[PDB]
Amino acid sequence: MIPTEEALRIVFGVSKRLPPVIVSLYEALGKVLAEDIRAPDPLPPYPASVKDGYAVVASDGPGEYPVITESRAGNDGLGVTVTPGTVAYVTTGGPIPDGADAVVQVEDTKVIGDSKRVKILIQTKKGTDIRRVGCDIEKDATVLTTGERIGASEIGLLATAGVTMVKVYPMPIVAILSTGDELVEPTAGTLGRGQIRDSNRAMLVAAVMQQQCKVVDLGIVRDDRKELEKVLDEAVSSGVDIILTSGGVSMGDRDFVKPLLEEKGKVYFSKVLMKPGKPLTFAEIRAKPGKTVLAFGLPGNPVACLVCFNIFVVPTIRQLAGWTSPHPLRVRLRLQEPIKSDPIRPEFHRAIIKWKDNDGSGTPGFVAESTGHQMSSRLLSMRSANALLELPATGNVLSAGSSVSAIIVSDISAFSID
Amino acid sequence: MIPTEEALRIVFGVSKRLPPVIVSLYEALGKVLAEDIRAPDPLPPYPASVKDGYAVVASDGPGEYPVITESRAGNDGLGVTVTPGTVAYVTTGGPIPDGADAVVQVEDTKVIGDSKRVKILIQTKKGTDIRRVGCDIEKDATVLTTGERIGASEIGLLATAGVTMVKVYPMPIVAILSTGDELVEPTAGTLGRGQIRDSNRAMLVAAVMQQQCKVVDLGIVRDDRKELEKVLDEAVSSGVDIILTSGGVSMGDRDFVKPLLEEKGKVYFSKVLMKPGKPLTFAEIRAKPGKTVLAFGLPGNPVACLVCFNIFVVPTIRQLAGWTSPHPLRVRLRLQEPIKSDPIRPEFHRAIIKWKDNDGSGTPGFVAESTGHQMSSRLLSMRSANALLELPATGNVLSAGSSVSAIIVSDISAFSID
Ligand SMILES: Nc1ncnc2c1ncn2[C@@H]1O[C@H](COP(=O)(O)O)[C@@H](O)[C@H]1O
Ligand SMILES: Nc1ncnc2c1ncn2[C@@H]1O[C@H](COP(=O)(O)O)[C@@H](O)[C@H]1O
Ligand code: MOO
Ligand code: MOO
Ligand SMILES: [Mg+2]
Numbered sequence: 001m002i003p004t005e006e007a008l009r010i011v012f013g014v015s016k017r018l019p020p021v022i023v024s025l026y027e028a029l030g031k032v033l034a035e036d037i038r039a040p041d042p043l044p045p046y047p048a049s050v051k052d053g054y055a056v057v058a059s060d061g062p063g064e065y066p067v068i069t070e071s072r073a074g075n076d077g078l079g080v081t082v083t084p085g086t087v088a089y090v091t092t093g094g095p096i097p098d099g100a101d102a103v104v105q106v107e108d109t110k111v112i113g114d115s116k117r118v119k120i121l122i123q124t125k126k127g128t129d130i131r132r133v134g135c136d137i138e139k140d141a142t143v144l145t146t147g148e149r150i151g152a153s154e155i156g157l158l159a160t161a162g163v164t165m166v167k168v169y170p171m172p173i174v175a176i177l178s179t180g181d182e183l184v185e186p187t188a189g190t191l192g193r194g195q196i197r198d199s200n201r202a203m204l205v206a207a208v209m210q211q212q213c214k215v216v217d218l219g220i221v222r223d224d225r226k227e228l229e230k231v232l233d234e235a236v237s238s239g240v241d242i243i244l245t246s247g248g249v250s251m252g253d254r255d256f257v258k259p260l261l262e263e264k265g266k267v268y269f270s271k272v273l274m275k276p277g278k279p280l281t282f283a284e285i286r287a288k289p290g291k292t293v294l295a296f297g298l299p300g301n302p303v304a305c306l307v308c309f310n311i312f313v314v315p316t317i318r319q320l321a322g323w324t325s326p327h328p329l330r331v332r333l334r335l336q337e338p339i340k341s342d343p344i345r346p347e348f349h350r351a352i353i354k355w356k357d358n359d360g361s362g363t364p365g366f367v368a369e370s371t372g373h374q375m376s377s378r379l380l381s382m383r384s385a386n387a388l389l390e391l392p393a394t395g396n397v398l399s400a401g402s403s404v405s406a407i408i409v410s411d412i413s414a415f416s417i418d
Numbered sequence: 419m420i421p422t423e424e425a426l427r428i429v430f431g432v433s434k435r436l437p438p439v440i441v442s443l444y445e446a447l448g449k450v451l452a453e454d455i456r457a458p459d460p461l462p463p464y465p466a467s468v469k470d471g472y473a474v475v476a477s478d479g480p481g482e483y484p485v486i487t488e489s490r491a492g493n494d495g496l497g498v499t500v501t502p503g504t505v506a507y508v509t510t511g512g513p514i515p516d517g518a519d520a521v522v523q524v525e526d527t528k529v530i531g532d533s534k535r536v537k538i539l540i541q542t543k544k545g546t547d548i549r550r551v552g553c554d555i556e557k558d559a560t561v562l563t564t565g566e567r568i569g570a571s572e573i574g575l576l577a578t579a580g581v582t583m584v585k586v587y588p589m590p591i592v593a594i595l596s597t598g599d600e601l602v603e604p605t606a607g608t609l610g611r612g613q614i615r616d617s618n619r620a621m622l623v624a625a626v627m628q629q630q631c632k633v634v635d636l637g638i639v640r641d642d643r644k645e646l647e648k649v650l651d652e653a654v655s656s657g658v659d660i661i662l663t664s665g666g667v668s669m670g671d672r673d674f675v676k677p678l679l680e681e682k683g684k685v686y687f688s689k690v691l692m693k694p695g696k697p698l699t700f701a702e703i704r705a706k707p708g709k710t711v712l713a714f715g716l717p718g719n720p721v722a723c724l725v726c727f728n729i730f731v732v733p734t735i736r737q738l739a740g741w742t743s744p745h746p747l748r749v750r751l752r753l754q755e756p757i758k759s760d761p762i763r764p765e766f767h768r769a770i771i772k773w774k775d776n777d778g779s780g781t782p783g784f785v786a787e788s789t790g791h792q793m794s795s796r797l798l799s800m801r802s803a804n805a806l807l808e809l810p811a812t813g814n815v816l817s818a819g820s821s822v823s824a825i826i827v828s829d830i831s832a833f834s835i836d
């Protein structure tokens with residue numbers, strides 16, 4: 001039985017970034033760049049007005065001048081030179097005509113007469129309200145680098161640079177199955193004796209969908225060694241990168257996941273020192289030519305299943321997808337209520353955390369409430385939980401107001417405020 | 419010109435939650451529940467073993483006993499009664515046979531002889547390692563409530579309860595267009611004089627895709643009043659809930675977005691006291707029978723466009739989609755470098771924030787680095803920015819180590835660690 005820190009080190013050392021692919025612009029969203037992106041031309045590519053107003057020769061100063069052209073876009077004012085004693089109308093983003101060296105915003109001007117004459121009311125300075133060529137982005141500047149995750153602003157930079165086919169690291173494809181003679185589909189109505197609905201599979205499909213991976217749903221598998229071997233062989237040869245099973249990893253006489261993974265590939269561990277649970281099998285299997293497939297034999301208890309997904313599977317998905325920082329966000333927070341820690345196993349205690357202007361100590365900070373009873377069979381303990389408090393194995397009661405480390409497991413930008 | 423707090427109050431007061439719809443299980447992921455969910459049966463629905471081992475009569479105590487049945491699932495052991503002086507083999511999740519009142523885990527037992535006899539090595543207590551009927555979830559208990567956002571554990575609870583068609587609030591459908599005679603498609607190679615690639619549209623499409631809304635891409639629209647009126651009329655009658663335009667809201671003689679929104683609907687504001695920018699038009703339009711459509715005339719400057727999306731459009735999407743807490747997460751943090759605040763406009767200064775074990779004050783906390791020059795034309799200032807620092811309008815230099823409020827704009831659970 002190994003500590004969680006070692007189990008994750010093992011997973012990190014085995015997990016390899018996937019080969020890069022070329023995708024379209026909107027397919028690149030959420031993916032990690034596998035190439036640097038250089039601007040092919042400057043931004044702006046022409047001297048551009050910051051304001052609606054008039055392009056002037058700054059040394060002319062306040063006075064009445066004829067408006068010799070109008071410049072908003074394209075070839076407007078092409079061939080026209082703004083000479084001393086003349087001005088040109090410009091709109092925001094409009095090309096500055098040759099000869100003009102400053103822009104006077106329309107608020108500092110007045111149109112004179114019934115054609116084309118304007119009164120400049122101020123003394124401007126050379127370069128005022130003009131964006132010189134390349135001031136926002138220089139031609140050939142690197143605007144995005146390999147290993148950078150693509151968000152909305154990064155899509156905007158790719159579009160600025162005219163890139164519509166992008167080299168990225170792909171997301172892994174994940175196969176998911178449930179195991180158990182006691183399971184029935186979640187469409188079941190009245191349950192027969194000794195039956196429960198399969199909840200782990202839909203929960204894991206949803207968890208994987210939140211990680212933006214393609215899912216291969218392999219359904220329910222019974223506690224029969226030959227049947228599970230056939231489904232695992234089919235999953236391995238299908239092209240997936242990760243296989244997630246749940247259940248079939250306890251001490252029962254029909255628990256075949258661990259021995260089948262030991263037969264098909266290399267099992268790095270099968271027991272982890274943590275609460276909730278203990279069994280968690282991690283294996284590397286080679287598909288027949290070929291490629292490597294990672295397998296997690298997740299615990300069957302719903303809580304243990306999702307906690308193991310959050311702690312071990314999420315960073316594996318991120319590493320395969322090329323993230324340079326796959327670790328989850330860890331923060332420090334104060335407990336809103338007392339919590340008893342376990343005397344042997346460090347606990348991943350589910351909590352609902354929020355940021356408060358006063359965390360109890362008179363300074364702003366995160367605070368946490370427990371989701372209640374932490375039994376691994378109680379999926380209600382995961383309900384609304386956006387963090388796992390890392391409780392060391394001391395057996396002591398951590399009083400309300402004490403500080404603990406916590407792993408943030410759900411959208412920190414989707415946190416409900418205090 | 420109104421303060422941002424008032425502009426958001428106006429948007430909140432006008433924005434209405436969309437009518438609920440019925441979706442399939444996986445379509446419910448990320449959506450807000452529009453009905454409570456009650457468990458139709460208990461979990462477990464039968465007394466279930468916590469361990470692999472033997473179901474016993476606790477008062478029998480240590481001794482050698484015949485194994486009278488094996489119970490793993492379904493009807494295993496149906497009609498069999500465990501009487502004093504007998505035991506039954508059980509696996510985790512297996513139904514406890516009638517008469518047994520405790521489970522002795524296999525580690526506390528030994529199989530005797532070459533048929534079916536076991537030595538119980540301990541004195542157990544009644545109820546040990548048994549999950550009574552309903553201990554995880556009681557029949558008719560409310561497992562999820564209206565207004566709760568559906569994550570992976572909530573999908574798991576829906577599956578537990580046998581719900582595969584769910585009543586939720588839908589996401590709004592968003593139409594997006596760009597405006598400008600200077601724009602060309604982002605597929606353009608060599609740019610002609612006075613042309614830039616349209617970057618706002620792809621950036622906004624990506625931003626809306628991150629909010630999980632369907633996008634209607636209406637393309638580039640020129641600075642022609644009749645053309646923009648036709649596209650806005652077509653967008654309004656198409657069925658969308660929100661229309662996002664960018665550009666065409668400055669002081670130029672061909673900026674038609676504000677007057678067209680004033681003609682088609684009710685403009686609540688067109689100018690906001692904030693840095694970056696100033697113009698931002700918000701309007702409510704009635705589609706011909708019917709329904710309401712919200713329109714944001716976003717600023718054309720790329721930075722101002724995305725900042726206005728993050729501050730005003732994201733909470734509007736969330737309110738329409740039924741979120742009870744649409745406001746973004748705000749935290750308090752320390753500056754890693756000095757920043758000059760503006761003397762008139764409160765600034766939404768872009769930053770890259772991270773959690774540190776020491777934030778500079780000797781206690782853990784968030785810290786922020788500026789993305790550099792904050793000019794609104796400089797989309798590189800949004801690159802990697804996961805927060806907007808809220809700098810009040812004091813004109814003073816905020817030194818490194820000083821505390822400021824910050825809006826978190828990107829996945830807090832996807833934050834790269836220190
Ligand atoms: N797919 C599933 N959905 C809900 N509960 C499960 C699932 N698989 C296993 N379990 C339960 O988790 C516990 C451990 O299962 P196992 O790991 O197969 O021994 C037992 O109570 C099982 O009934
Ligand atoms: N879709 C767009 N992509 C990139 N820049 C834009 C876009 N629309 C407007 N701009 C620029 O933003 C500034 C303000 O534009 P406008 O709001 O139309 O006056 C000008 O420099 C425009 O060229
Ligand atoms: O895996 Mo546990 O024994 O419910 O903490
Ligand atoms: O909208 Mo600004 O004038 O670049 O701070
Ligand atoms: Mg099982």
Ligand SMILES: [Mg+2]
Nearest residue numbers: 597598665666
């Ligand atoms: Mg324009």
